[PDB]
Design a protein around this ligand. Sequence first.
Ligand SMILES: [Cl-]
Length: 443
Amino acid sequence: VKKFPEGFLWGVATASYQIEGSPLADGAGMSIWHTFSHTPGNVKNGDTGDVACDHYNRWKEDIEIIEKLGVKAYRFSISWPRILPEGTGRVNQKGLDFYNRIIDTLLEKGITPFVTIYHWDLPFALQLKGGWANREIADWFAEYSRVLFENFGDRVKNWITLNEPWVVAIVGHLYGVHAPGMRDIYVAFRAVHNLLRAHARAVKVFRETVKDGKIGIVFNNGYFEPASEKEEDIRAVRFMHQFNNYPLFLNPIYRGDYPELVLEFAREYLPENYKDDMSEIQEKIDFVGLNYYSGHLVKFDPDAPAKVSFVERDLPKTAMGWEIVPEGIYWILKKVKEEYNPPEVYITENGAAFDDVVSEDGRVHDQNRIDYLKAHIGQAWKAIQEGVPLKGYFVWSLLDNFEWAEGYSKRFGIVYVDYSTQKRIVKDSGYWYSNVVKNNGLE
Ligand SMILES: [Cl-]
């Protein structure tokens, strides 16, 4: 037995571009992911988000699956260009109606909505004016956030500004692997900083508009381990934690500057007077969302892009080639309490990709996933027993979906989607998770 606190929030998570399809229905503007995925070469098999899970039509059914599984919270994102097709200015009522229906249904069924404002589908119109590179996005994003708060904050009270701003900045603008597909280190660090400014401004507006809600922000994290006791391996680890994990953003939010080893690597790429923005950046947040999947062995490496490389290891791995390290989710929960002590934490994503098949017997026997989930939930339970204020846990994902530059080739769902028919088939992991939520814990 591992019982969780009373009221602990068991969740599933999605994102708009990954599941909705119909990216241009009902007056929506193009997003950067529409243009990026329609560009030849950017995404595995030429996949796009044109159809996806077709949630834009099947939304009532999907929520009926959430209700049927007795899952208590649904984390979903809003497509900015469905709401304001040019990014600023004109509000598309039909985009607001689509999300109103999802919000009302969830509340009817007593399911708690957690809204992600930004999960990567920037309006193409704003990308043409620089996107996250342009300091003006702090105003654009505040105006968008304000529209959401005005229209939905009477019913939604749990809000997330940005999903994984490191990935948005660095994978989008330095590695060029995600939209908008750029490779410029100076842009990428201007984007980090603008993401902070935008986040803080949204928080400021939220205090003015939704005087009874809670607002937070979500970070990707890895559990990095050093290759040795060596000279500099423990430092590589230090650097990777500070750059890749929550501190790149929480050092500014909580302490008013970027982390030490980040400024060592990147002071030259950040704007000249970036500190002028840091007191506004410290706008108080109500919680921190941490996402966690894998862990990594890392070494000092004098030839690498940024003095760090990954030493591969012989550990179980998901279809992503990601190492299964369940104790990272404990480590990161302990570390956030230790370093910044936020009042409330949520695990906003945890999950895995495996090559799921439908069996002759009609079922998906994803024991590899049940094992992955059960193990990580156990490590989260542990951190609760050592005082980490963890108030909820969100499985990535309710559905198999468009997995960014991987396309439909990676399945992270607790419900299997057959794309040829759009039929949902609850996987074992999903029936299982249902019982975890019924029992409010393990065994
Ligand atoms: Cl600018």
